[PDB]
Amino acid sequence: KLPPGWEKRMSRSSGRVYYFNHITNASQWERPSGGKNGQGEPARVRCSHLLVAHSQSRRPSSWRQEKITRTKEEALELINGYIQKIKSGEEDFESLASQFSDCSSAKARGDLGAFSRGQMQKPFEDASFALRTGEMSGPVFTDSGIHIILRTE
């Protein structure tokens, strides 16, 4: 029971019963599913993401600032914060991706078009293919920094 990645947990020092995904890093009270077996995975998936980079990113630069100084932890604070804002409904994913993303895709609502396994960084890819149409991920790390993936197709 539970699609690839999913699991049942309980937050530290806080009695919370919810679902967690080891691949997407998504957290939610609601159960992801409710009999669709041998479902495997699609061959292609269109995705949008918002990327925050830190000092250890392969390319500590982006269209937002000539030189990235923020640390890993600081960049993670930002992701979380953007996630908090997305989920609360206070701010949609696209506008946040267009305002703060460190990938040139920011000028495209953060879209990346449909892709298949092979091109993207394995961490980002595994997440993307583990996400379902309309689902959003939790923090995702790659040599580019920390992402927030949103599968559109």
Could you please describe the fold and organization of this structure?
This protein is of the alpha+beta class and 153 residues long. The chain folds into 2 domains: 1-32, Ubiquitin Ligase Nedd4, Chain: W (Single Sheet); 44-153, Chitinase A, domain 3 (Roll). Helix content is 22%, strand content 20%. It is built from 3 helices and 7 strands; from the N terminus they run E-E-E-E-H-H-E-H-E-E. It has helices spanning 72-88, 93-100, 122-130, and strands at 6-8, 19-21, 27-28, 45-52, 111-115, 140-142, 145-151. Strand 2 and strand 3 (27-28) form a beta hairpin. The radius of gyration is 16 Å and the shape is globular.
Give the proportion of residues in helices. 10-25%
User: What structural category arises from helix and sheet content?
Assistant: alpha+beta
CATH architecture level-2 label of the largest domain: Roll
Name of the top-level CATH class of the largest domain: Alpha Beta
Largest sheet: 4 strands, antiparallel
Instruction: Output the helix-strand order.
Output: EEEEHHEHEE
Please indicate the percent range of residues in DSSP E strands (runs of 2 or more).
Answer: 15-25%
Rounded radius of gyration (Å) = 16 Å
Examine the coordinates and then state which fold CATH places here, giving the name of the CATH topology of the largest domain. Chitinase A, domain 3
Please report the total strand number as a whole number.
7
Number of domains: 2
Catalytic activity: [protein]-peptidylproline (omega=180) = [protein]-peptidylproline (omega=0)
InterPro entries: PPIase_dom_sf, PPIase_Pin1, PPIase_PpiC, PPIase_PpiC_CS, WW_dom, WW_dom_sf
Domain WW: 1-34
Keywords: Acetylation, Cell cycle, Cytoplasm, Isomerase, Nucleus, Phosphoprotein, Rotamase
